[PDB]
Design a protein around this ligand. Structure first.
Ligand SMILES: *[C@@H]1O[C@H](CO)[C@@H](O[C@@H]2O[C@H](CO)[C@@H](O[C@@H]3O[C@H](CO[C@H]4O[C@H](CO)[C@@H](O)[C@H](O)[C@@H]4O)[C@@H](O)[C@H](O[C@H]4O[C@H](CO)[C@@H](O)[C@H](O)[C@@H]4O)[C@@H]3O)[C@H](O)[C@H]2NC(C)=O)[C@H](O)[C@H]1NC(C)=O
Ligand SMILES: *[C@@H]1O[C@H](CO)[C@@H](O[C@@H]2O[C@H](CO)[C@@H](O[C@@H]3O[C@H](CO[C@H]4O[C@H](CO)[C@@H](O)[C@H](O)[C@@H]4O)[C@@H](O)[C@H](O[C@H]4O[C@H](CO)[C@@H](O)[C@H](O)[C@@H]4O)[C@@H]3O)[C@H](O)[C@H]2NC(C)=O)[C@H](O)[C@H]1NC(C)=O
Ligand SMILES: *[C@@H]1O[C@H](CO)[C@@H](O[C@@H]2O[C@H](CO)[C@@H](O[C@@H]3O[C@H](CO[C@H]4O[C@H](CO)[C@@H](O)[C@H](O)[C@@H]4O)[C@@H](O)[C@H](O[C@H]4O[C@H](CO)[C@@H](O)[C@H](O)[C@@H]4O)[C@@H]3O)[C@H](O)[C@H]2NC(C)=O)[C@H](O)[C@H]1NC(C)=O
Ligand SMILES: *[C@@H]1O[C@H](CO)[C@@H](O[C@@H]2O[C@H](CO)[C@@H](O[C@@H]3O[C@H](CO[C@H]4O[C@H](CO)[C@@H](O)[C@H](O)[C@@H]4O)[C@@H](O)[C@H](O[C@H]4O[C@H](CO)[C@@H](O)[C@H](O)[C@@H]4O)[C@@H]3O)[C@H](O)[C@H]2NC(C)=O)[C@H](O)[C@H]1NC(C)=O
Ligand SMILES: *[C@@H]1O[C@H](CO)[C@@H](O[C@@H]2O[C@H](CO)[C@@H](O[C@@H]3O[C@H](CO[C@H]4O[C@H](CO)[C@@H](O)[C@H](O)[C@@H]4O)[C@@H](O)[C@H](O)[C@@H]3O)[C@H](O)[C@H]2NC(C)=O)[C@H](O)[C@H]1NC(C)=O
Ligand SMILES: *[C@@H]1O[C@H](CO)[C@@H](O[C@@H]2O[C@H](CO)[C@@H](O)[C@H](O)[C@H]2NC(C)=O)[C@H](O)[C@H]1NC(C)=O
Ligand SMILES: *[C@@H]1O[C@H](CO)[C@@H](O[C@@H]2O[C@H](CO)[C@@H](O)[C@H](O)[C@H]2NC(C)=O)[C@H](O)[C@H]1NC(C)=O
Ligand SMILES: *[C@@H]1O[C@H](CO)[C@@H](O[C@@H]2O[C@H](CO)[C@@H](O)[C@H](O)[C@H]2NC(C)=O)[C@H](O)[C@H]1NC(C)=O
Ligand SMILES: *[C@@H]1O[C@H](CO)[C@@H](O[C@@H]2O[C@H](CO)[C@@H](O)[C@H](O)[C@H]2NC(C)=O)[C@H](O)[C@H]1NC(C)=O
Ligand SMILES: *[C@@H]1O[C@H](CO)[C@@H](O[C@@H]2O[C@H](CO)[C@@H](O)[C@H](O)[C@H]2NC(C)=O)[C@H](O)[C@H]1NC(C)=O
Ligand SMILES: *[C@@H]1O[C@H](CO[C@H]2O[C@@H](C)[C@@H](O)[C@@H](O)[C@@H]2O)[C@@H](O)[C@H](O)[C@H]1NC(C)=O
Ligand SMILES: *[C@@H]1O[C@H](CO[C@H]2O[C@@H](C)[C@@H](O)[C@@H](O)[C@@H]2O)[C@@H](O)[C@H](O)[C@H]1NC(C)=O
Ligand SMILES: *[C@@H]1O[C@H](CO)[C@@H](O)[C@H](O)[C@H]1NC(C)=O
Ligand SMILES: *[C@@H]1O[C@H](CO)[C@@H](O)[C@H](O)[C@H]1NC(C)=O
Ligand SMILES: *[C@@H]1O[C@H](CO)[C@@H](O)[C@H](O)[C@H]1NC(C)=O
Ligand SMILES: *[C@@H]1O[C@H](CO)[C@@H](O)[C@H](O)[C@H]1NC(C)=O
Ligand SMILES: *[C@@H]1O[C@H](CO)[C@@H](O)[C@H](O)[C@H]1NC(C)=O
Ligand SMILES: *[C@H]1O[C@H](CO)[C@@H](O)[C@H](O)[C@H]1NC(C)=O
Lengths: 321, 172, 321, 172, 320, 172
């Protein structure tokens, strides 16, 4: 014997997997890994971020102080969760540019409220309604103050509050739209009311519109909600001759990592740094196909449900004949 | 493949090579053998692990953003919110498609190259003692027992020892 | 003879073509194909999508019932074309957030209108105007009801209209701004008009403003147009003590694949799935430099007017020394 | 190119080869001739059709969007509408430029590679019966009529038939 | 002898530089170059673009004609710089959609004002205030005309002005909100004011609101500023029975390459075509990490502070 | 590298070669020497310079844009303005990262390839007068003085002149 044969080669597997390349739509490699997260844990994990269940309250109603949302009073969150079963149970109201108020509050992350000593001399305070039952009593939004005539008259209110703090103050205030002319004169004496809220740099003026609107929770009138942000060094001023829904204090505005999300998912104990409305997802892969709405440390949303990254050579199995 | 070895001049892969990605099959005076080559296996694996680490587990943290679903019809500004989101999603979708196409092309090519390199390293060791049979096989023109084969797998084969014998067998 | 020469080679062409690479701005290959669509068919193709020519009408004018736009009454479109020679020819008007309403109607793809039995008692309906002739008689916007004083009065109108359908109703209404103090009392008795259109979820109040504006088609006054979307389960409610330009009914809101485009290009028989203002374009190429405005299955707009994809090897012609 | 064949160790191309992308020119006992290799021509054509299919007939359907031209000055929200569109266009333009650059580099390289693989395929068949002359030519050291050439072209040439003749011509 | 040895090789350097690749986080190459501009010149260069220092004046206040901004009347720019120490010193005001007006003027690049001869019958022109002193005299915004009652009356004003030019006119006008009832009637006769500014295409109406606002430079009342664009061939119309703060003419709107930036950086002579709030930066690199806010011919902003592009081979030093 | 020369069958680089990127070290009848190869050095430099120009080529001129920092809290439209900017920056940041990774992989590979081409160019010229000893070295089996080495470097080496001397030294 005086020769030998030496052959070079490479491995192959029984079950390879197809991937895409620059030149081929499908070509078989020995192994691949999935880069698209397309399944969700099914629930929202509360161990990495502070997730708050809003239950039957919108963030807005909880801010306003709708009786059935009382327990949300000094609550904070990283993510606030809005249920599609949420409902308002106070006076019928509407908020011009609602979306912005919701966003501002959501971002702030807290509902911590600070009462201030507004003096309303010559008017009675703490007005309530049948539409807004608290326990068993006719009541109102805990953060708002319904002002009406004090026996005899309703004088021109002229109130100021300095912002000597070092953060922006958010003030919530409004106006009552009466359903009839005698309702207007019964509560506020004057035939046509007004609210002006101003600072050194901004002014807002609102005139009520007396009249009937569709019947809601007993009421034909409305309450319009507005907001004002007062900067450090500036001063809030409230000028009115009637129909004022007064503010009781301010919410503290924090620049933060907080948000709100609409979900009906279960909320439980697990670990995950990425929240979608479908529930949490792992973030081991760089891309996801679960939902374009996400919060946290998340793979990027893409339209593809699958993308395979080759982790092996071209698979060329032995001839089967 | 761009290097012409895997699914090129090597006809197919070996399903029974379970302990390496590249290697040798041989027949000599002691029987017939198979052996994995660790260095070339590890070179491909490291490269692929590099790719994997660069792509995998590095997500950004995002917090409050824009709305993306709507209950009311609004017009101008909702149109914009949707177009902004739609634009973002298509661009990332494209990034993901391209990334995977380019990586995969490159993975197939880099693994093909390792095979070709291992073949060329063998040719260099063997010098004038072997000829290329084709199919990725050499005819070694001298007696070459498991230890001799061993020295080739180990990168320490000394062509000089066998040269006279092998030159004799090649040219007669 | 005892030898032979065997040479290996590749082809080359006389006229090659320059492409771009990672390392070269311009290098010659044997063949390339163009990836940027930069010429247009020259006209808009009407076979793939339903393209409706607007002629002398804007979408808004067509919706409103500007007499010269009567032809567009129940029409639909995938794409509605607006011409630069369009014109209004009824009562002079403006719409706050004109652009949004155009968008909402464009997207809806239809002017399906359903009249409803609104009861306006104590006023006279169907006001006309020398600025809005229908044929040769003083008329008005077809989908609008010009309400004025009946007898010697104009009572506080109060009208509801529930939405018992499984879709959103688009209601168009508005107000008349008189150009003189007497014209106000002459038409509407009261010195100040008011319009409140409400739902269980929203409200809009508009106040007319008396005074002269520039002369357009005999008219010194104006009509401001507003809109209201009523949801399933909700109820439209209208309150007015004067100046109401009443809705006659509703447009149906379909969420669809429709749009509007401004173009002066001819519309003709041909097939193409991509529409630009310059005309239709082919969609074989993935990119285009014709126009950033497009509708349909389209190549993506980029700034480059040419991009060659190499479809051949490097060209190396024979020497001619 | 990265493989050093086309515009490399092969001096130039053949304008006269109209029947394929790669091939042979030869001189033998019967005169001269030229023939294309179909398998390497096809390998290259297939890959380029691959690229072409991933890039072409792939457009997306978009419907109602944001406005992109304006007849009035408006300020803040027109500004954003414009900025959004300008941002989108620049990003796509960048994708377009990069894609074509990468594809073209790769296309030049993959066709270069095919030239190299054909050269090597031929060298393998010829074994000890030929030497590399440079410029992509082989001196075949035995009589090789059209049938002999034919078998090289078919890839079924058997070096052992001619080895004695050629070894003798090669050395003395 | 009768033999030679010929070895092929490549160069290396004593110390190379680390780069990222597709497969490697850090690998050593012979040379590299930085792709991210991460330092700035420290000041805004004023030789490539016309850069105008706003000093104590916001662009808006310069436009309106705040007395301490008088110097800005005949001025144009490529880039207007607003300093954080700018202040207002006229009648306390507000502008709904302030940001849009700031954007429009900024973009236009000029404060060239063409005054027009409006006719104002039955009213007194040129109202002034203690809060807006020009020298020792009670004065006002130089581009605005504070109209008040004359004799016993203030008539319903009805004034027009055609646009016979081939460009868009920009008109700045406003309304006065008095702090009290007797102040309303003292100045305007009528009990409630109104301003309607109209064209053929558009209309704006504003009502004043009487009442107290926080004290600003002695003033309890306010002025609200609005704007109207008149198109070639159109006509501007102004109707008012009180409270009108009249326009004195128009600004010429250009579609231009102009802008405004907030920066407290020094402006000096030097060479650069890219301006950021931190100062100008060079543009020899395709990316920058200085600021997302830029003007001019600029590298693109990215989050990375460094990106090395290899400019040589893999570095394999000689060993031992 | 994908070609297996630099950091491959060439053990290390030469710090002492300061006038070129690639080249020759040799030992012959006239002594031991070093010389740079200009053609391969330039081929690599040209390609790198090409990249470098291509990356700076098209830097945009932008003017008025959107606001990107804010004094007051505003909600919806400010959320959209910030989200648009944040989306833009992230997409460019990705572009930048991917560009550098691809380019650097490609620069390492193309420099590796140049080393390999130079080796193969040398092998072709030497033909039957030399053998590959590994490590990037050839054993040349004939007296080869500086002019001879010169002709190899010049690409004008004529193997016929030395063949008999070399063939004899190789075998016997
Ligand atoms: C302009 O025009 C509108 C249209 O008429 C007027 O608005 C209506 O005003 C009345 C005020 O009394 C409203 O009547 C109330 O309706 C409620 C309806 O909701 C329930 O009932 C039905 C089922 O029958 C369902 O909608 C639903 O499931 C609810 O269960 C009733 O709850 C009220 O009923 C109570 O009061 C009446 C009268 O005292 C008693 O008969 C009952 O015992 C009961 O306790 C109530 O009748 C009506 O809903 C309003 N319609 C709308 C659309 O708002 C405006 O008043 C008018 N404007 C002016 C200024 O006059
Ligand atoms: C996480 O949660 C989200 C949100 O719920 C889920 O997203 C839904 O996914 C489904 C399944 O693909 C989507 O269904 C598809 O939408 C069509 C309707 O289009 C519009 O629908 C509403 C308009 O009211 C919009 O919200 C939406 O964006 C579209 O504009 C459906 O008609 C299609 O389903 C099928 O319908 C008919 C049935 O007769 C079939 O014959 C057709 O072949 C067709 O396939 C279509 O598949 C749905 O739109 C998504 N919702 C949203 C809000 O995006 C995710 O799936 C979920 N992820 C999980 C669980 O992993
Ligand atoms: C509705 O309610 C508001 C709030 O009470 C009333 O507005 C106040 O009106 C008073 C009286 O005009 C204002 O006071 C005057 O303005 C200046 C205030 O200065 C502020 O800042 C300085 C910093 O240097 C502090 O000293 C000071 O604490 C304030 O914070 C003062 O400078 C004035 O002083 C001068 O007046 C006296 C005589 O009055 C002169 O002899 C001196 O020369 C002296 O310099 C003066 O006190 C007060 O600022 C207003 N507050 C606000 C928030 O606007 C409204 O008038 C009221 N409206 C109605 C219709 O009732
Ligand atoms: C060009 O000019 C800009 C503008 O000045 C400079 O950017 C600033 O860079 C500094 C230093 O990096 C930043 O200061 C850091 O801010 C953190 C808070 O972030 C918020 O702060 C305000 C909110 O009011 C906003 O302006 C801002 O956008 C953020 O929302 C602080 O917490 C940082 O302190 C801490 O940083 C690290 C964090 O990991 C900690 O570990 C340390 O303990 C440390 O204390 C820090 O103060 C500043 O926010 C930037 N401003 C803006 C507006 O973006 C550029 O750097 C400059 N470029 C040059 C010269 O090249
Ligand atoms: C406040 O001042 C306004 C501005 O002056 C007043 O408006 C003007 O009022 C007059 C008389 O009512 C209008 O004249 C009418 O319109 C046309 C003229 O317009 C054009 O067309 C004709 C014919 O083709 C042509 O001859 C002209 O040259 C014009 O090109 C006449 O044909 C009519 O018969 C009629 O006289 C003015 O047009 C109108 N101008 C504007 C700008 O509105 C306004 O009425 C005053 N208001 C009050 C309450 O006093
Ligand atoms: C083929 O690749 C897959 C990826 O789907 C491997 O599975 C994982 O590999 C990663 C990276 O090496 C590691 O985190 C783990 O070892 C595996 N984890 C999980 C959770 O699956 C798989 O091991 C590979 N198969 C072969 C034969 O190599
Ligand atoms: C995650 O959510 C779960 C589910 O509600 C919380 O755990 C429950 O909390 C209630 C509060 O009254 C307890 O009575 C239950 O015993 C808990 N059940 C389970 C299954 O955990 C939990 O508090 C949340 N975790 C965090 C960290 O916030
Ligand atoms: C140059 O390349 C183009 C692109 O592939 C070739 O054009 C194709 O040719 C076939 C056959 O004629 C057509 O049916 C295809 O529709 C074309 N495809 C495209 C994308 O244009 C062309 O054949 C090549 N030119 C030459 C001379 O070979
Ligand atoms: C390696 O690259 C660096 C770039 O970082 C080069 O240093 C530069 O020198 C050239 C002169 O033509 C110019 O690009 C710059 O003046 C220098 N750059 C900087 C940032 O100062 C150098 O060209 C290269 N070094 C070697 C040894 O080739
Ligand atoms: C660019 O900025 C410089 C500095 O502000 C200006 O030049 C200075 O002008 C002042 C008076 O206006 C002189 O006292 C200085 O001598 C000048 N130079 C320096 C270095 O301070 C220059 O005018 C500005 N504008 C342009 C267009 O160059
Ligand atoms: C190199 O290998 C030599 C060859 O013999 C052995 O090969 C081994 C890979 C293994 O399979 C053994 O069973 C063979 O007998 C060996 O003699 C040397 O010890 C090795 N030396 C070094 C320095 O690596
Ligand atoms: C190519 O080289 C031939 C060899 O002579 C040269 O050797 C080198 C050491 C060189 O630097 C010179 O000193 C010698 O001339 C030479 O005879 C040929 O003339 C050269 N031909 C070309 C075309 O360059
Ligand atoms: C097929 O391939 C995948 C590898 O990802 C894995 O499920 C397994 O190895 C194979 N399945 C079976 C049933 O053999
Ligand atoms: C140049 O080449 C094209 C194909 O690329 C061919 O069709 C044409 O005939 C050539 N030009 C001339 C003038 O023949
Ligand atoms: C274009 O569109 C319509 C609808 O299909 C069709 O009736 C018409 O004949 C087409 N061509 C022209 C010239 O109108
Ligand atoms: C190839 O060519 C040979 C000789 O030219 C011929 O005999 C045979 O048919 C071909 N063989 C195969 C396997 O294709
Ligand atoms: C602005 O004016 C004040 C004095 O009114 C002065 O102290 C300040 O330094 C000035 N700044 C500039 C840039 O002119
Ligand atoms: C639009 O109106 C004009 C003027 O009467 C006239 O040309 C035509 O009737 C309309 N145009 C079309 C295309 O119908």
């Amino acid at each position: 014997n005086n020769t030998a044969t030496l052959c070079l080669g490479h491995h192959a597997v029984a079950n390879g997997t197809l991937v895409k390349t620059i030149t081929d739509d499908q070509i078989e490699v020995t192994n691949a890994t999935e880069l698209v997260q397309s399944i969700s844990i099914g629930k929202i994990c509360n161990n990495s971020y502070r997730v708050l269940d809003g239950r039957n309250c919108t963030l807005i109603d909880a801010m306003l102080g709708d009786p059935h949302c009382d327990d949300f009073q000094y609550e904070n969150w990283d993510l606030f969760i809005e249920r599609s079963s949420a409902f308002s149970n106070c006076y019928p109201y509407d908020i011009p540019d609602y979306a912005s108020l919701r966003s501002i509050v959501a971002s702030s992350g807290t509902l911590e409220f600070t009462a201030e000593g507004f003096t309303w001399t010559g008017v009675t305070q703490n007005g309530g309604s049948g539409a807004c039952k608290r326990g068993s009593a006719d009541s109102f939004f805990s953060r708002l103050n319904w002002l009406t005539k004090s026996g005899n008259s309703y004088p021109i209110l002229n109130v100021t509050m300095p912002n000597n703090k070092n953060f922006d103050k958010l003030y919530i205030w409004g106006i009552h739209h009466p359903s009839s002319n005698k309702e207007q004169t019964k509560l506020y004496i004057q035939e046509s009311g007004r609210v002006t809220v101003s600072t050194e740099r901004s002014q807002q003026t609102v005139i009520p519109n007396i009249g009937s609107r569709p019947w809601v929770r007993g009421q034909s009138g409305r309450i319009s909600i507005y907001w004002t942000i007062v900067k450090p060094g500036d001063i809030l001023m409230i000028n009115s001759n009637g129909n004022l829904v007064a503010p009781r204090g301010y919410f503290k505005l924090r620049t933060g990592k907080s948000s709100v999300m609409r979900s009906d998912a279960l909320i439980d104990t697990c670990v995950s740094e990425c929240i979608t409305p479908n529930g949490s997802i792992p973030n081991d892969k760089p891309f996801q196909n679960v939902n374009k709405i996400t919060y946290g440390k998340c793979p990027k949303y893409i339209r593809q449900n699958t993308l395979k990254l080759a982790t092996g050579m071209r698979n060329v199995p032995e001839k089967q004949i | 493949g761009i290097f012409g070895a895997i699914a090129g001049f090597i006809e197919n892969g070996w399903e029974g090579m379970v302990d390496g990605w590249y290697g040798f099959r041989y027949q000599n005076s002691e029987g017939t053998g198979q052996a994995a080559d660790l260095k070339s296996t590890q070179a491909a694996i490291d490269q692929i692990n590099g790719k994997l680490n660069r792509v995998i587990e590095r997500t950004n943290e995002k917090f409050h953003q824009i709305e993306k679903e709507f209950s009311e019809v609004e017009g101008r500004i909702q149109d914009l919110e949707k177009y902004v989101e739609d634009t973002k999603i298509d661009l990332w979708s494209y990034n993901a498609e391209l990334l995977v196409a380019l990586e995969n092309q490159h993975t197939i090519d880099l693994t093909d190259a390792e095979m070709n390199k291992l073949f060329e390293k063998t040719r260099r060791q063997l010098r004038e003692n072997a000829e290329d049979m084709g199919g990725g096989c050499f005819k070694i023109y001298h007696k070459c027992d498991n230890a001799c084969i061993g020295s080739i797998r180990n990168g320490t084969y000394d062509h000089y020892i066998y040269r006279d014998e092998a030159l004799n067998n090649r040219f007669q």
